[PDB]
Design a protein around this ligand. Structure first.
Ligand code: HEC
Ligand code: HEC
Ligand code: HEC
Ligand code: HEC
Ligand SMILES: [Ca+2]
Ligand SMILES: [Ca+2]
Lengths: 319, 320
């Protein structure tokens, strides 16, 4: 229709092929190594936590928990965004001050807070695991000492670029198949476009494109729509990334705080005066039916066989 | 909520103090070196083009030309954005593919294509100028070899952080003085807020916050600029566009990524696009213009540096 046509300008389907990372060429050995590192809990000092713990490829690329602290740029606990299609995000942080956010993008996003704080421990751990240096040599040829914090992030990044979810019903719709989604789905899309949601949640990743001066907070003055609202005040130090809504139906809970569990309530909360939006409960329901067509084909990811410790591998730090 | 209170959520005034750059502490000697480098045309192969050429601190931090190619991440000629407050930009490139744009921010944006392509040459140039190494040693103490590409960009960057324009009438209004802008400028603000302009042109910099799948293109479908150009967004689009900071917009014509639209009132009417869900009347556009005219801040008084002279070793200018 013209609804389809408008949708085809606002969004693009996820390509099936992993996107190319500038200055980070993919090769099977580098993808394979990134997969190992992504699932390797020895990257944490406890030896218990891997990327997959908080960005679980079985659970929509997130952890279905409210918040955690995973990374050095967080000022507090935040909900773990999906790693699925994360390589298509422009804005990669939940929130910050405008003057910081571009510099923060100097990355890497693929380092947890422990790795970023103690990159010497990361390298020493990997060098002490006999099967790693050979993989690093194969994945990063022509370097004398390829086992580096920067190459760890590069290998993860190329593996991460394979964690894309093409072929959601909405994407079949964008490709021109009007029947790929129900007519109620389509009405939800019409509301999404007309009410102005698409402006913030747009492009190939349907979001992750920018930061906005609205964040969902507790209302200071009985139900999630009554308890939380979109807030924007004079005193705001930080702006908020408007997230990609792809796979939103399988990555509850919602918002930077993880505090809203139901996708319907999230949608009602986004029907906010602060945003120029008023939606009825029946509107909210149609928008949800639409948001449920953004679930892509989930990657089937082999759990890696990790190289064993040596006697030299540092011990877990305890309890 | 009345218009001022709504404006106060949507935007914040430009602070008077240079923002702090992470991992790049300002000091007077690093600001001064960055000033020298910003104005030194020996950073270009011709030895005639400095950052100030295309981001001219006397002309709103831009060059008032339609387009140029200054930087390695451009795929084609683009309009030079202002350096004034650019340190408050989050989105720093005009346009690109989503999957490339975050990676590009591992920058530095302070490097022209000539600097970025030929970093040893840049270091060789600076090291051949006997007054530069001592300045790099002052600016970057405790570093045995401080004349490096990364230090040229850090020094520029802290100089650029001082190129902020606090005290626009509109900022005086955000701070609570309703009389700092005219009643017509306030109606243009109301229009700006009500029509949804502010969603994309938001925050301390009034834009530069994100990218959108809309760019101004020549219409293929009657004649003025509003006739000739339009917001376009198609299935075929490879690239999204940055929605720019509107601070100092009255003084940084021409407009959009292509610099094709010269009149701010025309840029405003073009943005009253059905693609964006916006319909504005001609008098609506005039009021919005009146409002945008209030976003001109106090322009930095910048001393032109005395640049250290060439030695006989300094590379020779090249024309191409
Ligand atoms: C192991 C090294 C990894 C990798 C490869 C990633 N992570 Fe996390 N992650 C967590 C939280 C709460 C956030 C949001 C933080 C914030 O911005 O405030 C993140 C963020 C990410 C991203 C960004 C995705 C995007 O573009 O938005 C990516 C790519 C990413 N992570 C990859 C939480 C956790 C953890 C919980 C303890 C752990 C462990 C990790 N992350 C580790 C990793
Ligand atoms: C920009 C001005 C926005 C408009 C208009 C809409 N949304 Fe939004 N959305 C925006 C931000 C900055 C955020 C994050 C807020 C926070 O505190 O975290 C959101 C969040 C959502 C979510 C949550 C998705 C997730 O957690 O993964 C959803 C489901 C959502 N937005 C949907 C939505 C709808 C239906 C809208 C129209 C009614 C709408 N959004 C408008 C920014 C903006
Ligand atoms: C013209 C020939 C230029 C010269 C010389 C320099 N710059 Fe530039 N700059 C130019 C353009 C056309 C653009 C936009 C490019 C794009 O497509 O995105 C830029 C961009 C910048 C920016 C980004 C501003 C922002 O939007 O956040 C900055 C900070 C910048 N340029 C600074 C800069 C410096 C420090 C230079 C000397 C080394 C310099 N530029 C040279 C055009 C030209
Ligand atoms: C996001 C969906 C936007 C809304 C809503 C509005 N604008 Fe915008 N604006 C947007 C982009 C992506 C761009 C760059 C487009 C390009 O090809 O370059 C712009 C550009 C402007 C400009 C030009 C500023 C400059 O070149 O420095 C102006 C003056 C401007 N926009 C004003 C404006 C008004 C008045 C709006 C509501 C009527 C409006 N914009 C909405 C993205 C978005
Ligand atoms: Ca979530
Ligand atoms: Ca301009």
């Amino acid at each position: 229709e013209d609804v389809m046509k408008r949708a085809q300008g606002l969004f693009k389907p996820i390509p099936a092929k992993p996107p190319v990372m500038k200055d980070n060429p993919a090769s099977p050995s580098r993808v394979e190594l990134g997969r190992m590192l992504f699932f390797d809990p020895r990257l944490s000092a406890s030896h218990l936590i891997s990327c997959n713990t908080c960005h679980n490829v079985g659970l929509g690329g997130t952890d279905i928990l409210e918040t955690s602290i995973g990374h050095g740029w967080q000022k507090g606990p935040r909900n773990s965004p999906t790693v699925l299609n994360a390589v298509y995000n422009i804005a990669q942080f939940w929130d910050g001050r405008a003057e910081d956010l571009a510099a923060q993008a100097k990355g890497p996003v693929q380092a947890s807070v422990e790795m970023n704080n103690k990159p010497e421990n990361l390298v020493a751990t990997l060098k002490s695991i006999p099967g790693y240096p050979p993989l690093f040599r194969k994945a990063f040829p022509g370097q004398g000492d390829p086992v580096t914090f920067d190459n760890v992030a590069k290998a993860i990044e190329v593996f991460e670029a394979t964690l894309v979810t093409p072929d959601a019903p909405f994407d079949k719709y964008l490709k021109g198949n009007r029947k790929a989604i129900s007519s109620t789905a389509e009405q939800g899309l019409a509301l999404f476009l007309d009410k102005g949601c698409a402006a913030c949640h747009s492009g190939v990743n349907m979001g992750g494109t920018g930061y906005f001066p609205f964040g969902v907070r507790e209302d200071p003055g009985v139900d999630d729509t009554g308890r939380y609202k979109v807030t924007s005040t004079a005193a705001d130090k930080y702006v908020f990334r408007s997230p990609s809504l792809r796979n939103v139906a399988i990555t509850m809970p919602y918002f930077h705080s993880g505090k809203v569990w139901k996708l319907k309530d999230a949608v009602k909360i986004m029907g906010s005066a602060q945003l120029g939006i008023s939606i009825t409960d029946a509107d909210a329901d149609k928008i949800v039916t639409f948001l449920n067509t953004l679930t892509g084909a989930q990657p089937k990811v082999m759990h890696p066989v990790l190289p064993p410790n040596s006697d030299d591998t540092p011990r877990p730090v305890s309890n």
